[PDB]
Amino acid sequence: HHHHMVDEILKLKKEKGYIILAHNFQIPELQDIADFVGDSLQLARKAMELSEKKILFLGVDFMAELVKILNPDKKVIVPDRSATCPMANRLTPEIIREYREKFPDAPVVLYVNSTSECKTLADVICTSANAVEVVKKLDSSVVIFGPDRNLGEYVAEKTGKKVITIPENGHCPVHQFNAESIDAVRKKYPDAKVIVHPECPKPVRDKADYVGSTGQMEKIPERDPSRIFVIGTEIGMIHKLKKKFPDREFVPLEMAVCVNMKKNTLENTLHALQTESFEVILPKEVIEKAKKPILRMFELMG
Numbered sequence: 001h002h003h004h005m006v007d008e009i010l011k012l013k014k015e016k017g018y019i020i021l022a023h024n025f026q027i028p029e030l031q032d033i034a035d036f037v038g039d040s041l042q043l044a045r046k047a048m049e050l051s052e053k054k055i056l057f058l059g060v061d062f063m064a065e066l067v068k069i070l071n072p073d074k075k076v077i078v079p080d081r082s083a084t085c086p087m088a089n090r091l092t093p094e095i096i097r098e099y100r101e102k103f104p105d106a107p108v109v110l111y112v113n114s115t116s117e118c119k120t121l122a123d124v125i126c127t128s129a130n131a132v133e134v135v136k137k138l139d140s141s142v143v144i145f146g147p148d149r150n151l152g153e154y155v156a157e158k159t160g161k162k163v164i165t166i167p168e169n170g171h172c173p174v175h176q177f178n179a180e181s182i183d184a185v186r187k188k189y190p191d192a193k194v195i196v197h198p199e200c201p202k203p204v205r206d207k208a209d210y211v212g213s214t215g216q217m218e219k220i221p222e223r224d225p226s227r228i229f230v231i232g233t234e235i236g237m238i239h240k241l242k243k244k245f246p247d248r249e250f251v252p253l254e255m256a257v258c259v260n261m262k263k264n265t266l267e268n269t270l271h272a273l274q275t276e277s278f279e280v281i282l283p284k285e286v287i288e289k290a291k292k293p294i295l296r297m298f299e300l301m302g
């Protein structure tokens, strides 16, 4: 059944020379057939190291495109071409240009969860792990930041800089946990450590033991010996964490599912390898323009 699809996927990936890259929010069945599972930038950087020239990418479109931007001569395919990030998609070129006009001395800092077109208009890209450091290192004490207001506000708190968030009410619906869920797990597991994403709202961040990216979450049990961790992010990370640390318990803060990440299935992944579709193609000019603020990020962090 799934053994058939899994076996055929493994067979076709080897036969056709594909490396499979899966985001942390993919279903467990897809994480387990991937060569590498990680966050968007981790995956794009990993691809840069590969001898293979064909990639099957399992995530959402801005991430596949990030891989393509940094690996332009590889064929990058995705099983569901509609898999997208609604938060990214709410920020537009028009809004970025309006805000640059109003605040022409403010660098435009765009979270990696952003469309590739929007990236072409950014001064620097950031990830949830490096946003604070990126913004600290910028000359300016004021920045334009999008598309996530929560991450922006977190960055403001940590840097003491003024962060002008765009678009209005930009947020990830998946990470809108209730702070009351933390109150409830504290009572239920008094010794658990609560780790939440910086995309979570402030009251959730402030009640957590740790705030971090998924990449940061998976490093925490290397330094914290706690038996139980409660996890405030998308449900896919539970599988990732439990696989890496089988000796610990990982409890979801709440059940939170990214419908777009769940568009990828064993069946459409198999179809993708059978047909070698759908190729992620960006105009040359988009790749060249979007590369500029990505390199600026690498420079700042180096």
Ligand SMILES: N=C(C(=O)O)[C@H](C[C@H](O)C=O)C(=O)O
Pocket: 024, 038, 039, 040, 041, 085, 112, 113, 127, 128, 172, 199, 213, 214, 215
């Ligand atoms: N912040 C992320 C993460 O995986 O921690 C995002 C992905 C996700 O869509 C955010 O909620 C990324 O991979 O860059």
Ligand code: SF4
Pocket: 060, 084, 085, 086, 087, 088, 113, 172, 173, 174, 175, 234, 258, 259, 260, 261
């Ligand atoms: S979890 Fe949130 S930020 Fe990530 S792809 Fe889904 S809607 Fe976008």
Ligand SMILES: [Cl-]
Pocket: 070, 071, 072, 073, 074
């Ligand atoms: Cl390349």
Ligand SMILES: [Cl-]
Pocket: 137, 138, 139, 140
């Ligand atoms: Cl600068």
